[PDB]
Write an enzyme that holds these catalytic residues in place. Structure first.
Site, mmCIF file in Angstrom:
data_model
loop_
_atom_site.group_PDB
_atom_site.id
_atom_site.type_symbol
_atom_site.label_atom_id
_atom_site.label_comp_id
_atom_site.label_asym_id
_atom_site.label_seq_id
_atom_site.Cartn_x
_atom_site.Cartn_y
_atom_site.Cartn_z
ATOM 1 N N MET A 89 63.565 67.728 16.315
ATOM 2 C CA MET A 89 64.164 67.815 17.647
ATOM 3 C C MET A 89 64.682 66.467 18.135
ATOM 4 O O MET A 89 64.125 65.891 19.068
ATOM 5 C CB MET A 89 63.145 68.347 18.660
ATOM 6 C CG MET A 89 62.649 69.754 18.396
ATOM 7 S SD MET A 89 61.534 70.315 19.698
ATOM 8 C CE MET A 89 62.689 71.108 20.822
ATOM 9 N N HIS A 108 69.158 75.699 9.814
ATOM 10 C CA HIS A 108 69.466 76.219 11.155
ATOM 11 C C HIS A 108 69.273 77.741 11.188
ATOM 12 O O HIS A 108 69.801 78.454 10.340
ATOM 13 C CB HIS A 108 70.910 75.869 11.522
ATOM 14 C CG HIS A 108 71.293 76.255 12.919
ATOM 15 N ND1 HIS A 108 70.810 75.603 14.032
ATOM 16 C CD2 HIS A 108 72.114 77.229 13.381
ATOM 17 C CE1 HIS A 108 71.319 76.155 15.119
ATOM 18 N NE2 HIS A 108 72.113 77.145 14.752
ATOM 19 N N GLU A 141 78.349 64.456 11.696
ATOM 20 C CA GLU A 141 78.193 63.824 12.994
ATOM 21 C C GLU A 141 78.188 64.881 14.098
ATOM 22 O O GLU A 141 77.379 64.820 15.022
ATOM 23 C CB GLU A 141 79.308 62.805 13.227
ATOM 24 C CG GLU A 141 78.920 61.716 14.218
ATOM 25 C CD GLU A 141 79.936 60.592 14.288
ATOM 26 O OE1 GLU A 141 80.249 60.008 13.228
ATOM 27 O OE2 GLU A 141 80.413 60.291 15.401
ATOM 28 N N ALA A 172 63.312 83.990 5.480
ATOM 29 C CA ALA A 172 64.526 83.659 4.736
ATOM 30 C C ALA A 172 64.686 82.145 4.628
ATOM 31 O O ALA A 172 65.151 81.630 3.610
ATOM 32 C CB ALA A 172 65.752 84.268 5.412
ATOM 33 N N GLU A 173 64.301 81.434 5.683
ATOM 34 C CA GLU A 173 64.393 79.977 5.692
ATOM 35 C C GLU A 173 63.513 79.375 4.599
ATOM 36 O O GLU A 173 63.889 78.399 3.959
ATOM 37 C CB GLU A 173 63.950 79.428 7.052
ATOM 38 C CG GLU A 173 64.910 79.713 8.211
ATOM 39 C CD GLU A 173 64.300 79.335 9.562
ATOM 40 O OE1 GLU A 173 63.623 78.288 9.631
ATOM 41 O OE2 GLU A 173 64.494 80.074 10.552
HETATM 42 N N1 LIG Z 1 74.742 64.158 13.892
HETATM 43 C C1 LIG Z 1 73.883 65.170 13.817
HETATM 44 N N2 LIG Z 1 72.551 65.006 14.170
HETATM 45 C C2 LIG Z 1 71.764 66.168 14.039
HETATM 46 C C3 LIG Z 1 70.385 65.953 14.417
HETATM 47 C C4 LIG Z 1 69.444 67.050 14.347
HETATM 48 C C5 LIG Z 1 69.853 68.384 13.898
HETATM 49 C C6 LIG Z 1 68.945 69.386 13.854
HETATM 50 N N3 LIG Z 1 69.430 70.477 14.865
HETATM 51 C C7 LIG Z 1 69.245 70.220 16.234
HETATM 52 C C8 LIG Z 1 70.431 70.390 17.065
HETATM 53 C C9 LIG Z 1 70.381 70.160 18.495
HETATM 54 C C10 LIG Z 1 69.134 69.743 19.152
HETATM 55 C C11 LIG Z 1 69.088 69.510 20.615
HETATM 56 O O1 LIG Z 1 70.125 69.668 21.316
HETATM 57 N N4 LIG Z 1 67.879 69.123 21.137
HETATM 58 C C12 LIG Z 1 67.465 69.010 22.549
HETATM 59 C C13 LIG Z 1 68.102 67.784 23.233
HETATM 60 C C14 LIG Z 1 67.805 66.417 22.594
HETATM 61 C C15 LIG Z 1 69.045 65.715 22.040
HETATM 62 O O2 LIG Z 1 70.041 65.538 22.793
HETATM 63 O O3 LIG Z 1 69.028 65.330 20.854
HETATM 64 C C16 LIG Z 1 67.929 69.568 18.313
HETATM 65 C C17 LIG Z 1 67.980 69.801 16.881
HETATM 66 C C18 LIG Z 1 71.254 68.618 13.507
HETATM 67 C C19 LIG Z 1 72.204 67.508 13.579
HETATM 68 C C20 LIG Z 1 73.621 67.654 13.210
HETATM 69 O O4 LIG Z 1 74.199 68.670 12.801
HETATM 70 N N5 LIG Z 1 74.396 66.421 13.362
HETATM 71 N N1 LIG Z 2 64.565 73.761 11.615
HETATM 72 C C1 LIG Z 2 64.481 74.802 12.693
HETATM 73 O O1 LIG Z 2 63.239 74.623 13.356
HETATM 74 C C2 LIG Z 2 62.393 75.835 13.381
HETATM 75 C C3 LIG Z 2 60.948 75.484 13.265
HETATM 76 O O2 LIG Z 2 60.599 75.180 11.909
HETATM 77 P P1 LIG Z 2 59.183 74.764 11.356
HETATM 78 O O3 LIG Z 2 59.099 73.200 11.740
HETATM 79 O O4 LIG Z 2 58.121 75.594 11.916
HETATM 80 O O5 LIG Z 2 59.187 74.817 9.904
HETATM 81 C C4 LIG Z 2 62.956 76.659 12.264
HETATM 82 O O6 LIG Z 2 62.720 78.047 12.345
HETATM 83 C C5 LIG Z 2 64.459 76.285 12.225
HETATM 84 O O7 LIG Z 2 65.215 77.160 12.994
#
Ligand SMILES: Nc1nc2ccc(CNc3ccc(C(=O)NCCCC(=O)O)cc3)cc2c(=O)[nH]1
Ligand SMILES: N[C@@H]1O[C@H](COP(=O)(O)O)[C@@H](O)[C@H]1O
Length: 200
Positions: A89, A108, A141, A172-173
């Site tokens: 997160m 995801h 990004e 599935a994950e």
């Molecule tokens: N540049 C890049 N970095 C990422 C970092 C984490 C995740 C995991 N998926 C996530 C995508 C979004 C969030 C999110 O909006 N969190 C709450 C607010 C905190 C924040 O603003 O961070 C968290 C995990 C995916 C990406 C991605 O596709 N690209």
């Molecule tokens: N990566 C994202 O975070 C959720 C929690 O995963 P886990 O940390 O319990 O494995 C997952 O189900 C996926 O959508």
């Protein structure tokens, strides 16, 4: 290939990756598990597997673009080749995403062009789809927009809630994340040159 798994909670996907990388034919080894939180169950699973654990907090230093530097430090420390985001997160900064481009994967809970964001299941249910699923892709990004590696469809049942749907999708994950890691660690799949996935 040396792997670093970054978490934030329970770590159900981490465990799947642990069990998978323990198999004799695994081309990947998990050398370090990093968490942005401290009381997460993911750390116990890591330690129980004999994997070095390391946690980084925000209230423990400066802003972000530096937070990733603290992470990247431990990454260089353990000579990491691949990074797996397993329920992390925290959106990573452009420089970090740039350095590990084509070497960082994310899981995801949706069939990706649809429902980007941290509440994919609520979106799916609100939208009314009868089919959703999960996606493993290279981290770009722009959030949840990197090149897709693997995907698996999962049905939505009438009366489903975030609790019941996420439970079905997690099954599935636990299958495609480990499979996707093996494809990249073995060199079978790479980000390529034209930006799109390449299957050697
Ligand atoms: N540049 C890049 N970095 C990422 C970092 C984490 C995740 C995991 N998926 C996530 C995508 C979004 C969030 C999110 O909006 N969190 C709450 C607010 C905190 C924040 O603003 O961070 C968290 C995990 C995916 C990406 C991605 O596709 N690209
Ligand atoms: N990566 C994202 O975070 C959720 C929690 O995963 P886990 O940390 O319990 O494995 C997952 O189900 C996926 O959508």
């Amino acid at each position: 290939a040396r792997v670093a798994v970054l978490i934030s909670g329970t770590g159900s996907n981490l465990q799947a990756l642990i069990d998978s990388t323990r198999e004799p034919n695994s081309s990947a080894q998990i050398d370090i598990v990093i968490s942005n939180k401290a009381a997460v169950a993911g750390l116990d699973k890591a330690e129980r597997a004999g994997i070095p654990t390391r946690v980084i907090n925000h209230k423990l230093y400066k802003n972000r673009v530096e937070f990733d530097s603290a992470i990247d430090l431990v990454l260089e420390e353990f000579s990491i080749d691949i990074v797996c985001l397993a329920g992390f997160m925290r959106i990573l900064s452009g420089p970090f995403v740039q350095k590990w481009n084509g070497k960082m994967l994310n899981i995801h809970p949706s069939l990706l062009p649809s429902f980007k964001g941290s509440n994919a299941h609520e979106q799916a249910l609100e939208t009314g789809v009868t089919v959703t699923g999960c996606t493993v892709h290279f981290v770009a990004e722009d959030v949840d927009a990197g090149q897709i590696i693997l995907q698996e469809a999962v049905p939505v049942k009438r009366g489903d809630t975030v609790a019941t749907l996420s439970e079905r999708v997690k099954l599935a994950e636990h299958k495609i994340f480990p499979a996707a890691l093996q494809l990249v660690a073995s060199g079978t799949v790479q980000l390529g040159e034209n930006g799109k996935i390449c299957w050697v």
